Design a protein around this ligand. Structure first.
Ligand SMILES: [Co+2]
Ligand SMILES: [Co+2]
Ligand SMILES: [Co+2]
Ligand SMILES: [Co+2]
Ligand SMILES: [Co+2]
Ligand SMILES: [Co+2]
Ligand SMILES: [Co+2]
Ligand SMILES: [Co+2]
Lengths: 80, 80, 80, 80
C-alpha cells in the first residue's frame, strides 16, 4: 500500500480480504493477491474492518468518520 | 464523530454497528447510518467493542475502565 | 484497572470477559462486573486476547512475550 | 519474541496461535508453546492476523504490505 498496514484484515464469505492502510485507503484484495478495489478516506485507516450480514464493510478512519462501504467499493454512508 | 475512529466496529445480531471514538464515546449506529445512541466514557475509546451472548456491549477506555453497556445505551457496569 | 484499557475484550463461552490493560495485567471479569482473576505480565497488555478451543486465553504483552493463560488465571506458558 | 507483541493472536482450526511482533515477524506457535515457524516482514507487525477458509494467514506490516502466508510459513503473496 502507500503506508503502514496497522489495520487488521477481515475476510469476506467469498475470500476477499479487506484491510485499512495509513495511506488513508480501505483495500479489498482478492485471494490471489490482486486488487479488487480501494476506497479513499480522509485519514489513516487504523480501524480494522467488520463485515455485515449483507456484506457491507464498516471501518473507522482517523478523519473522524465511521465508513460503510458496499461490497463493490462504493460508499454507502459515513458517520462523523 | 468528534475524533479519530481508531476502534474497530462490532456488529450486533440486528445489524447495529458499535464503535468507539477518540472523542470519548462509544457509538451505536443503525445499518442505515443513523445514530441509535452514544455513551460517554472519560477518555479515548481505542478499544474495540465485544458483544456478549445477551447483547451486552463491552469496551475499554483510556480512562482505565472496562465498560459494559446495555443494548439501549445505558450503563450496566464499569470496572477500573 | 490501573491504566488505559487499549486491549479489546474477548468473551468466553460462559460469558467471562477477558481484556488487557496498560497496567500490565490481563483481566478476567465476570458478567456481573466482579473480578474473576488478573494476571500480571511485564508490560502493557495492548494485545487483545484470543480464546482457544479448550478455553486457553492467549494475549501478547509489550514485554515481548505471547502469554497462554489457563481459564483459572494461572500461567500455562509464555513465548519470547 | 524480539519485541512488543502489540498484534492480537488468531487461532487456527488445529489450535495454532498466530501473532505478530514489533520485531518484524509473524509467529506461528503450537498449543504447547513451541514455535512452529516465523516469517520476517520488513517492519513491525502491529496488524492482527486473519485466517482464510483454506488456512491462509493474512496480516499487515508497518513495511506497507499486506502479507498472505501459507500454513507452512512460506510466503504466498504480498500486496503494497
Ligand atoms: Co512507511
Ligand atoms: Co495521513
Ligand atoms: Co482529528
Ligand atoms: Co480526550
Ligand atoms: Co491514565
Ligand atoms: Co508500564
Ligand atoms: Co521492548
Ligand atoms: Co523495527
Amino acid at each position: 500500500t502507500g503506508g503502514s498496514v496497522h489495520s487488521s484484515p477481515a475476510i469476506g464469505q467469498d475470500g476477499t480480504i479487506y484491510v485499512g492502510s495509513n495511506d488513508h485507503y480501505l483495500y479489498a484484495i482478492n485471494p490471489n493477491g490482486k486488487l479488487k478495489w480501494k476506497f479513499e478516506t480522509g485519514g489513516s485507516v487504523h480501524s480494522s474492518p467488520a463485515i455485515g450480514q449483507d456484506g457491507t464493510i464498516y471501518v473507522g478512519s482517523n478523519d473522524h468518520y465511521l465508513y460503510a462501504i458496499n461490497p463493490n467499493g462504493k460508499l454507502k454512508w459515513k458517520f462523523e
